[PDB]
Design a binder for this molecule. Structure first.
Ligand code: HEM
Ligand code: HEM
Lengths: 362, 362
């Protein structure tokens, strides 16, 4: 039903992946650091309510008739729906509030990558809130109300709705398929792998940035798929792109999805061969992205793809080397990176008196 | 995950319980070959039979020739039917082709211009539509994508619309969903069990003057943007006054329970429910079946969202048009704008495994 909001880490990273996503990047409009801290506190209080399935503030009705209700009401009668709300701080936040020297060195700007076609309006952002839930209206409600609460101090830079499995009728160990029709997530870091999370996902104090201890670094990439071109490719071409077969998802030369891959048997620019840690100095990622389908473009083509999300202990040692190695990926023919942003995701809200960003702002 | 039966006197997706998700696609016809279009309808009907049963189209998603593209694009593998329905409709512009001019139904009336309209012509109209409703958005998108692919060369997607959550009800025994203004939407609709009301208000009859449409219905679609910023500034009383129902319970003003019958003269003379009620419209009654949408931001700091309004009726001239005309003075107008529109004649049902979409017309 619900996922606990308080913890050493923020929820929404290691906790089980929910069916839907509403991701929002915000820009900060206030220049007053105390006013911003006041928002972080007010947002933290709202998130405690939202993630327990309650209305923010004094609620969505029953208040004074002349007052706007504190909560806009569209989640009334719904369930917590495993909602998690994960906040992150983008590089540009640290140019405000005297925060320049507290920007973590592990919050690296991404290089330009071959084939990039980034829409600047749907890239970057001073802040992010990742809202994950099984019910998309619960996630949209949470983003809508956080934006409302913050209006006057923040605005919404860009917003992305995503989906994965529908858990009411899809087994939870079952690997979801992306919109190219392939299983996506087979060889990933799982939230159960607490030791691997310490090695590859969570910032440690010794890493250089004490306030980020127990946080993580997030890379977001809005990746369009050339659906109609991909659907014209042969089965063999599609399986060659990835190094796994389509129906079972097994590596080339293996029978079972989760059999470990034999990379030599894949084509040299197969996606799995290029992305595997063995090909990247051991670099390993927690992938947590969602499919999207926004509509139809002007040409009749499906505006669809993957909202790619990766959490790692250090952007410089996670996403950057893996994505760099994808320069020659056979998959590049069928995809285009069209938005990008990075965020430092602080440690968790430790108890009922803690607030988002308290380790950064004090 | 259960299956909604595809065959019947009527197409499913109308009186059917309203499913959680929508992918709605408008198509333009590009072939002038009536025989090829008829062949397309039969192929589409065959594919819909598979899709609505949770099966892959054609020869399947894999296991064919390596050199051939798979028949089915594969992203619904391992999913369930998820109450998928696929409902096809024919726009007025279809009847300019294939010698159909004289078969265009009188009840398929063009809408008048309405005050406040700001209709995007590129996301309005359409030679035909397919409404895909399912509890799993991936199942809905997979259905539309594969129908469009099967139709490559004969039809093109003109525009499409995703609905992340329903704002309608044909099941008054279940919870009435809320729209993004936070109000229950669908309380006083038509239920799938109200067979007499469906015959009276929804299903075309032979005596109505268009024999091929007996057992079909007529669909109006309106993409309605919501002025969320302005709404969220409004007091609780202003919001409740706009509709004529309270917000929490959704009861008519002065009533304690959602489904207590309204006393209209107690509502403001411009209240939405007062103006829309059958008694204010010569008994005109609609089956509403819309969904909420988001569409990113306005580029200027604001979430952009709305409601994809769908109404089924026995005759557009005695359903949507008189009601929408009476909404000319609606208090709700301050908070919405109609920005896309389309009408379709939705043919009778696919009677059995030998039948095909549009067989009574063609
Ligand atoms: C639309 C874009 C993409 C699609 C469709 C896609 C698809 C896939 C598929 C089908 C697999 C095999 C199953 C699995 O183990 O998860 C996979 C694996 C993987 N992908 Fe991607 N991927 C995309 C983008 C990316 C990006 C941008 C990165 C990193 C920069 C990435 C990194 C990885 C990694 C690390 C693996 C696991 C490889 C292993 O250790 O065996 N992918 N991806
Ligand atoms: C964003 C646009 C709209 C919103 C937010 C909205 C909202 C609502 C709400 C909250 C109700 C009361 C509960 C119910 O009985 O369903 C309602 C009722 C109704 N609406 Fe709307 N509506 C919109 C557009 C329309 C349009 C365009 C039409 C027709 C042209 C329409 C026709 C009706 C009717 C017929 C009723 C039921 C009245 C009765 O018999 O009591 N609505 N609407």
């Amino acid at each position: 039903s619900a996922v606990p909001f308080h913890g050493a880490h923020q929820a929404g990273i290691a906790t089980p992946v929910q069916d839907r996503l509403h991701f929002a990047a915000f820009d900060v409009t206030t220049e007053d650091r105390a006013a911003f801290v006041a928002l972080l506190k007010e947002w933290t209080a709202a998130a405690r309510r939202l993630t327990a399935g309650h209305a923010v503030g004094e609620g969505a009705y029953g208040g004074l008739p002349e007052a706007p209700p504190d909560d806009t009401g569209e989640a009334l009668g719904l369930k917590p729906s495993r909602l998690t709300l994960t906040i992150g701080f983008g590089p540009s936040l640290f140019t405000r509030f005297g925060l320049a020297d507290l920007r973590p060195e592990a919050l690296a700007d991404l290089p330009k990558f071959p084939g990039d076609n980034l829409d600047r309006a749907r890239s970057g952002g001073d802040l992010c809130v990742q809202a994950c839930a099984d019910d998309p209206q619960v996630a949209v409600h949470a983003i809508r109300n956080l934006a409302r609460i913050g209006f006057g101090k923040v605005v919404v830079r860009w917003s992305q709705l995503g989906f994965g499995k529908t858990s009411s009728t899809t087994p939870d160990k079952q690997t979801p398929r992306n919109l190219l029709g392939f299983k996506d997530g087979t060889r990933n870091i799982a939230g159960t792998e607490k030791d691997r999370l310490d090695r590859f996902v969570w910032a440690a104090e010794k890493d250089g940035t004490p306030w980020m201890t127990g946080g993580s670094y997030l890379v977001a990439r809005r990746i369009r798929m050339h659906i109609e071109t991909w659907d014209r490719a042969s089965l063999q071409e599609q399986e060659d792109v990835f190094g796994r077969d389509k129906g079972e998802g097994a590596p080339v030369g293996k029978a079972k999805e989760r059999d470990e891959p034999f990379l030599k048997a894949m084509k040299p620019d197969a996606h799995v061969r290029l992305a595997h840690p063995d090909s990247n100095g051991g670099a390993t990622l927690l992938r947590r992205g969602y499919s999207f389908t926004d509509g139809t473009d002007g040409l009749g083509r499906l505006d669809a793809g993957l909202f790619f999300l990766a959490y790692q202990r250090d952007i410089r040692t996670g996403f950057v080397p893996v994505q760099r190695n994808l320069a020659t990926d056979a998959l590049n023919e069928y995809i285009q990176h069209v938005g990008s942003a990075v965020f430092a995701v602080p440690p968790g809200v430790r108890d009922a008196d803690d607030w988002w960003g308290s380790t950064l702002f004090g």
